[PDB]
Structures are given as structure tokens and as C-alpha cells.
């Protein structure tokens, strides 16, 4: 797993055309959203993560949480993003891990938002300038 | 080299604290900028690119140009971005290749902007939703 963490003034998106044949089923409220003063977590699920979806997820939960605490962010947004890696995971496994992370973050007490997996999306973001406002992390299972 | 191409309604940035001891020397006009209807090229210069800075640059020039033509973009923005890879190039080589690409793009007739290398930057962007508005490419020298 490769994650890009951006402390942002805001994030906003709108679902467009499907990017996959079997994308993530979404409700009407899911095709658009916005959060402010939020840690946006752009996530790229990799092939190696298929070795242990749960381990990778718990580790990602921990890392993202740790950074949210550092920048004092109460909001987190899970943004499916495949461009952080070329060694991508099977779509079904990517969705499962993205859900595990999303769910784990809410169980930790954060207000968490997310964008659907499998669709092209227009989106806007504003990255603060601070040293810790734009970080990347590599999380993998101990093989 | 790893590149993330985003067709955007606009890009805007403001230089903040130095992220390196010897960042890129910048003028007053260089610490902030904005472009609209622009292909933003987030670029991560890798260690392997040190084998042939020129070859990698020409290839990147070609790929970026080819996508700008596809989305019918007249503006291109070179955005130093190290999070697309973990195998990063020496800062001096990264700067040289980022300059070669920037210069090559202008020689092709595009209006090209860029952000300084080596500083933390607040930035805002709006990615269109179109299928070709968010692409990534891996460019490496034939070893």
C-alpha cells in the first residue's frame, strides 16, 4: 500500500463516468461530497497487500490516525487513488481494504468521509503549506 | 520517472518553508502562481533517471505533450512532486531534469508554468472529471 496524506482546507468531489465495469455501488449522496479542515488520504492498494488485507488495513489505520493527531485533524477523507503505484491489487481486494480503513478510522472516533471506488471523479483540494501537510507512506504486510 | 497528469480547471500555489537546505533559487514572482485550463504534470524524478537525464527528459517532454494534445490543453504546469516514488533522484539531478522538461515544453509552443523545487507549498487544484483528466506515466531510460 502507498498512501499520500494531505492536510487540506477542504476536499470536494463529484462522481463521473464509471472507470471499471463493476465499480463500487453508490447511493445518491455518494456521488458528491465535501469536507473542510481535513486529512485527505489518497490510497493506492497494491498487489502485495493481498497477502494480508487485515494486517495492511490495521497498519494503515494506525499510520493515518497518527498523522491526523500530529496535524490536529478531526476529519479524514479516504480517496481511492491508484497512481501512487503500478503494482495494483485486484479491484475486489482494493475495495475491501479501502472499506476496512474507512471503517477503522470511524471506530477510532474521527469524522470520516470517502469517495466511491471505480469511477472517474472531478475533485478540488487545497493543501495547507505546512511541513507535515503533505506526506507519503508505504505500508506492507510482513510478507 | 513517475508522472501524474491532471487536466485541471486551475492550479495555484504559494511557496512556504524550505524543504531542503539548498532549494531552488527563486524570484519574487516565483513564490506564487496560477494557471487555468491547464495540464498539471506532477513529477517525481527517480534514481534510475540519473543514468541518462537527457533521454528521460526528452521522453517526458513527448509523453506530456502527447497528453496535452489529447485533452486539447494549451497550458502545462510542471509541479515537482516526490510522492509518486520512493526511489528518488539526487536533488541536483532532479532539478536539472525538471528544468529540461520545463524548457522542452516551452520550445514545443505550449504556455508552461512551474513551481519551485525544494520548498513546501500550499496549492489548490480542480481536476476535471473526464476519463483522460487524471493519468499516470512511468518514463525510464533504456538503462
UniProtKB/Swiss-Prot annotation, chains A, B:
Intrachain S-S bonds: none
Compartment(s) of residence: Cytoplasm
The keyword Transmembrane helix is assigned to this record: no
BP GO annotations: threonyl-tRNA aminoacylation
Entry GO CC: cytoplasm
Keyword Glycoprotein: no
Principal location class: cytoplasm
One GO MF term attached to the UniProt entry: threonine-tRNA ligase activity
Region spans: Editing domain: 1-143
Result when mutating residue 120 to A: Isolated domain has nearly wild-type deacylation of mischarged L-seryl-tRNA(Thr), no longer binds L-Ser or L-Cys. No activity on threonyl-tRNA(Thr). Same results
Protein role: Catalyzes the attachment of threonine to tRNA(Thr) in a two-step reaction: L-threonine is first activated by ATP to form Thr-AMP and then transferred to the acceptor end of tRNA(Thr). Edits incorrectly charged L-seryl-tRNA(Thr) via its editing domain. Deacylates correctly charged glycyl-tRNA(Gly), but neither glycyl-tRNA(Gly)(2'-dA76) (the terminal 2'-OH of tRNA(Thr) adenine 76 has been replaced by hydrogen) nor the 2'-fluoro tRNA derivative do so, strongly suggesting the editing function is tRNA catalyzed.
Subunit relationships: Homodimer.
Membership in a protein family: Belongs to the class-II aminoacyl-tRNA synthetase family.
Domain note: The N-terminal domain (about residues 1-143) is an archaea-specific tRNA-editing domain that has a highly similar structure to Dtd (D-aminoacyl-tRNA deacylase); the domain binds L-serine and L-cysteine and most D-amino acids but not L-threonine. Editing of incorrectly charged L-seryl-tRNA(Thr) by this domain is tRNA catalyzed.
Name of the protein in question: Threonine--tRNA ligase
Organism: Pyrococcus abyssi (strain GE5 / Orsay)
Gene this chain is encoded by: thrS
Included stretch of the parent chain: 1 to 143 of 625
Amino acid at each position: 500500500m502507498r498512501v499520500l496524506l494531505i492536510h487540506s482546507d477542504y476536499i470536494e468531489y463529484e462522481v463521473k463516468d464509471k472507470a471499471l465495469k463493476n465499480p463500487e455501488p453508490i447511493s445518491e449522496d455518494m456521488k458528491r461530497g465535501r469536507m473542510e479542515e481535513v486529512l485527505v488520504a489518497f490510497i493506492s492498494v497494491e498487489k502485495v497487500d493481498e497477502k494480508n488485507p487485515e494486517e495492511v488495513s490495521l497498519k494503515a489505520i494506525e499510520e493515518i490516525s497518527k498523522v491526523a493527531e500530529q496535524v490536529k485533524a478531526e476529519n479524514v477523507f479516504v480517496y481511492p487513488f491508484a497512481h501512487l503505484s503500478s503494482e495494483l491489487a485486484k479491484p475486489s481486494v482494493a475495495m475491501d481494504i479501502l472499506n476496512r480503513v474507512y471503517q477503522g478510522l470511524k471506530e477510532r472516533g474521527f469524522n470520516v468521509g470517502k469517495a466511491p471506488f471505480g469511477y472517474y471523479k472531478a475533485f478540488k483540494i487545497s493543501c495547507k503549506g505546512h511541513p507535515l501537510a503533505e506526506l507519503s507512506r508505504t505500508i506492507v504486510p510482513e510478507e
